[PDB]
Every structure is written in C-alpha cells, then in structure tokens.
Symmetry: C5
C-alpha cells in the first residue's frame, strides 16, 4: 500500500478540515518534491518554492500563503490545541505571521510546562536529601533525581536547538525575505515584524536555558554537600567506636590479669582476702585511669 | 475590571508625579502598542517609535524625549530611590543620557551590594569549615553555603544577561543612533557619549563577573580540601583502632591459654606454684612481644 | 617492488571494475601528483584539477566527472556495499552529486549503527549498577562501561571532525563552485543543491553529537548516584556495628565484674547464695540499662 | 578639603618632578574632564583629547606628547622603579612609544615575578603531599596550597584582562592611529611599531596564562592521586583489621567452649586429665584451622 | 665579552657551514635589528625585511631567499637532523618552501614521537590499576601516571600554540604574500602552495590534539572506575566484619551467662550435672539462633 499523510488543514478564516492523502498527490498539489517532505531533522525551519516547512520533535507543519497544514497529528494529544485554540488565533497582517507565531508559541509553552513540572520535584527531592538529621539517605529518591536530571538534559538540548535555528535565521536577511512568501507570490515592513517575532522567541528560550542551567548547578552543589555530610557522620561514628574500643581493651587487659591470678592451682595467696579486695580495687581504678589516658591521647591527635 | 499601570512620571526639571492609568490610555498617549508594553523578558532594552523601553528583573521604564516613566513600582522598596535620589540626578546633555545613566547606575549598584553582602558570609563559612582542628564539620553552615552559592549563581546569570544586552547594543551603530530619540524627533557627537556610557557599564559588569567566578572557584577548592582533611582523619582513627585491636587479640589469645590451663578438672599440676607463676609471667611478656611484633608488621606495610 | 593501489571503478551507468594499478600510472592517468594521493588526514575533502578527493577513517575515494574510484578496499568488509548497493544508487543530476551523496550516506549510516549498538549496552549496564538493593557492584560490568565510554568518545570525535569539514566547506562559496567539476571541465542551480546536501548531512551529524553528549552526561550522573549509594550503605553498616559494639563493651565490663568477684581466693562471701543471685541479676539488668543509655546517647548525636 | 592628586611627572629628557595638585587644576591644565580621570576600571587603556589614560590594578598613568604623569604612587613601593629605572628608559622614536613600553614591561615583569614565586611553593607542597609513604597528610600544607591556588586564580584573571584589552586595541586600526597623539597634535610607520609592541606583550601574556593553566591542572591531578592513595591505605588497614577479627572470633568461641566445660558444678569428668588435655589440644588446633579457613574464605572473595 | 650566536648555515645546493658570529655582525649582514633576533616567544613565525624568523620551544631559524640559518644548536642533539637529513631535503620550487616544510615536518615528527612514547605507558598503567582482582593499588604506578599526565598537558599546550600560529597566518593573505620573500626581493601560484602546506600541518596538529584529548578523558574515566572499585571492596569487607562481630557479641553474651552461673560461691545447684549439661546445650544453640537472627536482620536492611 502506498504511504499516506494524515493531514489537517486550516484556512485563513479559521475553517478546519481533516483527511488522509497520498504523498504523491500532496507533492503534486504543492510545488514540492519528496526531497523536502521527508522530515529527517529533529528541529528544522526551511523554505522551498514559497512554502514554509517546519518540524519540531513531533510537530510537522507546512505553511502556504493561503492555508496551513499539520501532518501526522494522530496519537499525539494535539486535538485540544488543533480544534479549540488554533482557529481562534488564526481568526491586518498576513497569514504566515499568525501561523508561525502560533506554532512557536505552542512549542515555547510546551517547554515552559516541562520546566515548571520538573522544577518542584527536583527541589523537594534535594531538600529531603540535604537534611543533615539523617546519617543515610533514601535511594528511590536518588533514582527519581536521576530520571529527572535526564529529562532536564533533554529539555536543555531541545532549547539549544530551538535557539540555534532561530538565531541562524535571524542573522541573515535573505531568509527573512524568503519567509514573506505572500509578497513574493503576488508582489509597514515585513522584515521588522519577523525580526521582532524571532527575537522575542529567542529571548524566551534563552531565559528557559538559563533557568535549566541554574537548576543543574544546584543539583551538583547539593550532591557535594551530601557527600560532605555523609563523611562527617562516618567520622563521628568511627570516633565513638574508637572511644568504646579503648575501654573494651582496658577491660580485657585487667580481666586477663584477674583470670591469671585466679587459676585453679596453688599461688600461696588464697588465705588472705585483703589481697583479693586490693586486686579488685586496683584493677577497676586502673581500668578507669588507662581509659581516660587513652582518651586524652586521642584528643591530642 | 480593565488592567491598569501604576506609573510615576519624572519631567526634565525633576518634578515628580504619580498616578494609575489604563493601559489603553497609555498606548494612546504614546505611539506604542500592547505588543511593546508587555514586558515578557527578564532583561531588555528596545526602541519603538522614538521611545526607549527598558526592563530589569523588576524595574520597568519608558523614556521619551521630554519625560521618564517608571511602571509597577509598588511593593518594591523603590520609594527612597524614586523620591530622594533620582530628582537630583535628573536636575547640557539631553534627557535620555541622564535617564539611562541613572537606571544603569541603579542596577549596577544593586548588583554590587548583592555581591558585597554575599562575599564575607561565604568567606567566614569557608574559613570555619576548613579549620583542620576538627574531625567533623557543622551542617547548618553547609546549608548556609548552599543557599549562598545558589544566590551567587543567580547573580552571575543576571550579570551575564546585562553584559550580553549592553554588548549587543554596542556592536551595532544603528541602535546607537536610535537611542538618540530627541534628535530624530526634532532634527559634539551623541554616539561617542553613548558608547562611553555603555562601555563603562559593560566593564563594571565584567569586573563583577570576574569576582563572582573567583569566589565560585574558591568554594570548589575549599570543598576539595575538606574532603581531603576528612579522609586523613578517618585514616588516623582507623590506624589507632587497628593498633588497639592487635593488643586486644593478643590479650584474648593468652586469656584463652590461661582459661584452658585453669579448668575445674584434674591436670596433675595443682601441687606446684612455680609453674603457675611461670605461666603468668610468660603469658604477659609474650602478650607484649606479640603486640610489638604486630605493630612492627603494620609499620612495614 | 613499486607500490600499487587496489582500485575499484564505477562508471556513470553503474558498471563495476576492479584491479590493481601502479601509483605512477594512476597519477599519469589523472592530472594529480603524489602530493595529493597521500591520504595523511583522518577526515578530508579536497579538490585538485577538477578531481574530488575524499578520505574517511578508512575510506578513500576519488571522484571525476565521468567515474568514481575507491582505493584500498581489501580486508574492510566493504564488498556488500560496493557490489550490491552502490550500483543501484549510481544508476538528471550530474555524477558528482550522486557519488558524494552515496559516500556521505554510507558514513552517516555507519555512525548511526555504532551509536545504536552502543546505547542499549550502556543503558543496561547503568540500570544494573544503579540498583540500590546491593551494597556492592560488579566490576566486569564496570570494565565493560569503561570500554564502551572509550568507544563513545572516539565516535564523538569522528562526528566532530565530520561536522567541522562539512561546515568549513559550506561557509565558503568558492569551494561549492569547485565541487561542480563537470561544469568547469565542459562549460537549476548546482550551488543550491550542494548546499542542501551538505546542510542535511551536517544536521544529521549534529543530532548524533547531541545524542552522544546526552549519553555521556547520563553516565556521569549514574556514577555520582553510585557513589552516594555506596556511602549510605557504608554508614548504615557502621551504625549497626557501633550498636553491637556498645553491647559487647557492656557485657565485657560486667563479665570483668563477675570474674573479679569470682577469683579462686577467700572473699568472706561464699557462704551466702542470695548475694550471688543479686549480683547476677544486677549485672544483667545493668548491662541492659547501660546498653540502652549508650544507644540513646548515640541517637542524640 | 578639596581632593588632590599626588603626581610625579617625567619629561622627555628624563627629568623628574613630584608634587600634589588639585583635581580641578589638573583638568584645566589638560583638556580632560572629571569623567575621564575617575579610574573606575581595574584595567583600562583609553584615549581622550590626544591624551592616553592607563590604569592597572594600582598603577594610574597619563601620557601626553611631551610628558608622562604617574598618579597616586604613595605607599606602593614604586619609588625604586620611578626614581632609578624609568629615567634611564625614557632617556629617535616619539615619547609615547617609550612610555607605553615602560609601563607594559613593568606590569609584565610584575606578573612574571608573581608566577615565579608561586610555582616552587606549589610544586614542593604537592611533592610532599603525594608521597605514598604516609597514610595521612598534613593540613597546614593544605591551607598553604589553598591560599596559593587563590592567588593563582587572581593572577590568571589579571592576565586574562590584560590580554583582552591588548587584543581589543589591536583588532581595530582607529585606536592604533589614536595612540599616535604626537602626530595628530602636530601633523617609517607608527602603526607597525605599535602593532609589534602590542603583539609582543600579548604573546608574553599568553605564555604566562598557559603556564598558570598547566599549574592548575597539575594541582587537580595531584588531588585525585591523593584521594586514591588514602583510599588504598584505608582498604589495606581494614583488611588487616578483618584478619585479626577472625582470629579474635575463633579464640572467643573456643574460650566459651572451655568456660562452659569448666563451670563450678558437677560434670562427671573431673576424675580424668586425659580428657582435659584432649580438650585443650583440640580447642587450640581447631582455633588454628578455623582461622585459616576464614582467611581462605576472605581470599576467595 | 660581547654575546655571540652559534650558527649553522645551509645553502640552496645543500652545502653546510658552521661557526660563531657576533650579534652585531649578524644584524649588519642582514637587514634586521636586535629587536627581531631576541626570541622572547615560545612559538613564533614572523617576517621582517624579507627575512623569515621562526622559533619553536628550542629551535631558532632565520630563512632568507638564498640561505637558511639555525641558531643555538649546541647541546640539543640536533646533529643527526642537521648533518644527515636536512641537506637531502634541501637538495623547481623556491628555497623558502623547502626550508619551511623541513622545519614544520621536524616539529610535527617530534610531537608525534612524544605522543607515541606517552600512549603505551599510560595504557599499561591504567590497565594494571583497573584490575578488579586487587583490593588495593600500587602507588609508584600512580606517580608515573601523574608525571605522564603532566607531560601530556605540556604536549597539548605545544600543539595548541602550533595550531594557533598556523591558523593566524592562514586566515590573512597579506602574511601569505609576505612569506614569498624571493619574489618580493627580485620580482603557478605561490599562495596556493603555501596555503596547502599550512593546511596540511594544521590538520596533522588537529589530529594529534584530538588523540591527546581522548587519552586524557580515558584517564579520568579510569580514575572514576578505580574509586568505585575501592568503595565496593570496602563495603564487602565491612559487611564481613559486621557478620563476624554479630557472632562475637553472641558468644560474649553467653560466655557472661556461663561465667555468672559459674562463680566461686554457693548457688545450690552444684549437686546436679543435668542442669550443667542443659545450660551448655541451651547456651550453644541460642548463640547459633541469635547469630542467625541478627544475620537475617542485617539482610532485611
Ligand atoms: Mg531528544
Ligand atoms: Mg533569576
Ligand atoms: Mg579515532
Ligand atoms: Mg583581583
Ligand atoms: Mg612548555
Ligand atoms: Mg570517599
Ligand atoms: Mg573457677
């Protein structure tokens, strides 16, 4: 079966149509070729035969002087935007300005929503992790943080490509003149308006990129602080363990002393209890003094 | 209710007025449109119909040949600057130069104050943390450091956008000529003076950026030194624990020897005390020698 | 023996020939010199005497207006591409466009295959390592990750050089005109078509580079999370060891007490069992209380 | 009291004068204004009314066709350079070349001295720290390293601003022509000589920057090696502690066995010594075998 | 004594001479001044009075239309290159091309040799370190790695300066025309040949730089893997130590129980052996059960 395109068409007045059409018929209707309607690039804005071709991550659009076409809209939850919002926007400037503004605004709003969803989750996770009241931290939250960081990196890449394309178009004026397809087809400055639009969207994308970068550096700083806190807790607990081990060693030493003096043999000292009491007292007090002196020695270090 | 703008107006002589006006009335009074007085960008300097439009993080200003307007000044502690300092500054060069200089100086002073407040806190916190006399470090100070680093990153971003805008205006001369709205409205070089102003403020911002970068790298180096100190303390305490464990092991070994020789049974050796004394002496001295030899073995490693 | 080149030649119609020829004979047949057919650069696209010379990591090609030549194809598993696919591609545009498109498509497909092979292995390895259910991680998987990261870095370098060469050619128009060797030899716009080709391949390479960068940053984040998890497990186990050591210390203390009270001597207390039972009970309960109080003290920290 | 400038003046012949003068009198004597002699930038080279104004970190200079002036030289140990070296340098090229060369050479020599002082200290400290013969490292040396790294970062920033200013002047030719104040005031190529001077100093600064960067990367590598060494020592000592703990556990186990068999009760086995000797021998040998088997088990891991 | 230069001179035919000459005599023989033959820059290529002046790290060369001069060749093991290889290379293009090609080829070969020597040592050291079969790693190999990394950084810097100089010359055409000193002195395109030479050497240097960068990133990844392996071994050994400590604690607990029940007093239970056997059996089995239950509790965590 020959491949087909599921297209939805918007007119100047805002009227909407939807259908499916063969690629060859689409090429014949327009002045394009299969080389153009291939959509091999993640982000692209191009002009061919007075027709504008735009592609986002998943949005494919063709703009003509008298109509707009969205291709492959099925299974992408675009119905609300297509059948409820776009007609209002499209209903003195030409059609190209309105269409380009609508598409760019949609993409920018999508990116803003992504960032606004990502920010609070990361902030809450970092606030929970940095809490110095716990010697350990949860790991499910760490996995969540990793996934959200991956999503943030993808968002940063998308913003970067958006800005790159917009700036590449802005620098040259030939492309700016090309975007005015209506005047070329059927011959106030259009160039100024297009420059204003592109500059506005470029600045918005730059703001988003700065916010994402700030979030990433915050993540890194939080990771470093987490490392420091864990190391400090380790050192505290090891100090306590050493302090207890000193006492254990002293106790074992004097227990060996007592055991050796208390063998089941003859020592010529079983007829006196004063010696026994003296040994008990001296062993206990010496345990105490040795423990204290070892504590002081550790403190000296 | 229709939206309104809370505006304060400064004249050439420095006279001050304040009121609220509908956005449509503002647009009609000037030659602008709602597309311009939207304020969608964090930092922006633009020119439209011989009117300069400036926006900072929270400062919104419109400059005309004969007046200046500050918009949305309520609840921003700007009263001291507006009603005490600005009139003196505004009271032979045209009005645009004075207004632009005042606004840029205000923003630069704000950034300088932020940096001057941030620096000593971070320096004191790092000095306290780096102290090698403690095996552990406080965590409230770590949280303070994290918050101040976040603020520092935000300040760096603000300085970056400021410099970017200033340099973008400086490179082109068409924008420099545009800023001379008074001459265009009613036709010594203005371009040289504007270039001097913008270059001065750009250089000040560059100095601030360099200072912030130095502070950040200092923070990173301090973190690394903290890690090293904690690891060294860990190793010292573990060495001490191992040294004590050697003695504990030797003591336990010879205690087992004594216990085994001192069961409540018959060993055919309970009639002699010389053997008992010999066993006590040899067990103690051998404990000592084994402890010393294990210490030497550890030292060999 | 004089050096030779193992060449395979493709004609306009797609006919294929293969043989070996002396370098001097090759130079004489073309208008080149040994200075050109030296192949000292990993990636290179050049034009000499209306002949295009291209080199990839291991692919060496010479393009003329009427023929294409691939050099040193032996022992490189290029037979499938040479004798099965290329003739179909080469069978209204001139020959240079088809040849360049074929070579660039081959290289791009090779890079895409490399990346598609690398991605799932790294993802699976990282997913296995990040599993927080294990206090330790395997090391063979770490070695695999290291090798795959090295391969990824090599791939990134290759993509970078590809993009650099393509962009260097695109910026200038003299080189674009040079690539149209057929028109120069024997005098619709060729420049536009060549620009489209190069821009398409540059954009594809940029997408690949972005994907590789995302993978690398993911690797780094996974490493950090692994460090954090290991430290947390360390702290947990050390806390448990300390808790057990407290009880061991208390038990040893009261065992020393009992041993001291139970020497094989006279203590004037062997005629009463109530004292013995009291000592047993008090030593046990005090062991419990001291253990609990030390646990509470640790909890206070 | 009106502010004043402490100035020292050098003539063409090298004659020296020194005094203090009011800022207004200085402005009147020259053709400048207070806007110029403000010195708000850390590093600056500018030209105003055929007068060159230069500022370094602490050096302030004004160059005219017939004289040189150094401002605010008190309490900066500049007496040796001012009254011993500069007159010799200033005594066929015009005065501006000599003055600029002198100032730039002074600054470059200062930076070189800073770097030459910093290098050996850091190298010695790193050599001492990296010594793998110590399980721990000193902390005073770490503080010294931190301070020297801060100084190195400041030096890098200074070199960067120096290079930026020199290159900004070099790129344009209008500024190069401006620097030839003598010819403009009273109308072999001066531009070539100035370009040579600036290029020479730019190259020297670039060399210094490269050296500083190499030092910094060396510091980072040394830090990583220190971390690795500390971790290895930790692991070694923990392995030894585990080996000793195995023996302690076996000894305690068989000591419990002996104690249980040696209660102060009736066991119907006190009439035979062969059983006692057998128990002693078997407990000792089994202690040995269990210790060895646990050692082998650890080795298996 | 006046300073002198130890020079070796090559003619067009390849004839070689060597001697020492005063700097003033050298300046007089050529059309240069002491300002030129100062050699203050690590890497430099310049043209003065139809004479080319080149300096590498330690190679100093002056090229004229009719001769080449190498200065300060003593104690630099350059005899083999000077008296065995260079004459063959120098024996239709002018002399400047041959001389420049020879010098650049020498430098490139030197850099290639450095890199080829450095690579295998680092690879072997990293392969030895990454071996996961050892809980610890050697430190002499770490010192070797540090030294080789320092050398690699120096090599990268040298390659960078080489590329910077070559590209700076390539971008401008005035310098390219300047390098053709022979035509200027005594008036096929020379510019094309010089561009080809410089581009070839620039590309070779770029390849070397990419290789060095790959090596450095490999080093960093290996360091991270080493850290991970050490941490995993630490955790394993700590888990084993905890498992042994559980058993030690249980054994000590029940040993205290036995000791308390076995005091040298009256307990009204010395007339029955069944109680003694029951206590022994229950203490042993309970030791086992408590050890197993603590093991399960640890496993739960
Ligand atoms: Mg993506
Ligand atoms: Mg902000
Ligand atoms: Mg490679
Ligand atoms: Mg400074
Ligand atoms: Mg060097
Ligand atoms: Mg660590
Ligand atoms: Mg007894």
């Amino acid at each position: 079966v020959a491949p087909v395109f599921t297209v939805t068409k918007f007119d100047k007045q805002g009227n909407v149509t939807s259908f499916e059409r063969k690629k060859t018929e689409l090429y014949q209707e327009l002045g394009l070729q299969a080389r153009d309607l291939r959509f091999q690039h993640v982000m692209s804005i191009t002009v061919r035969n007075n027709r504008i071709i735009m592609r986002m991550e998943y949005l494919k659009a063709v703009i003509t002087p008298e109509c707009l076409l969205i291709l492959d809209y099925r299974n992408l939850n675009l119905e609300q935007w297509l059948f409820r919002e776009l007609p209002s926007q499209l209903s003195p400037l030409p059609f190209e300005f309105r269409a380009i503004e609508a598409l760019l605004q949609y993409w920018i709003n999508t990116l803003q929503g992504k960032l606004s969803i990502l920010q609070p989750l990361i902030l809450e996770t970092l606030d929970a992790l940095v809490d110095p009241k716990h010697s350990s931290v949860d790991r499910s939250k760490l996995h969540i943080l990793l996934q959200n960081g991956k999503s943030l990196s993808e968002l940063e890449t998308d913003i970067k490509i958006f800005k790159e394309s917009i700036l590449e178009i802005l620098d040259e004026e030939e492309l700016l003149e090309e975007l005015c397809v209506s005047k070329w087809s059927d011959p106030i400055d259009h160039a100024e308006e297009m420059e204003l639009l592109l500059e506005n969207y470029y600045r918005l994308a730059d703001d988003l990129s700065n916010a994402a970068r700030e979030l990433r550096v915050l993540i890194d700083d939080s990771q470093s602080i987490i490392f420091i806190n864990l190391d400090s807790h380790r050192n505290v607990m090891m100090r306590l363990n050493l302090q207890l081990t000193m006492g254990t060693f002293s106790l074992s030493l004097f227990g060996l002393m007592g055991v050796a003096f208390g063998m089941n043999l003859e020592s010529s000292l079983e007829e006196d209890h004063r010696i026994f009491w003296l040994i008990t007292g001296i062993m206990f007090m010496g345990s105490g003094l040795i423990w204290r002196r070892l504590l002081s020695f550790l403190g000296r270090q």
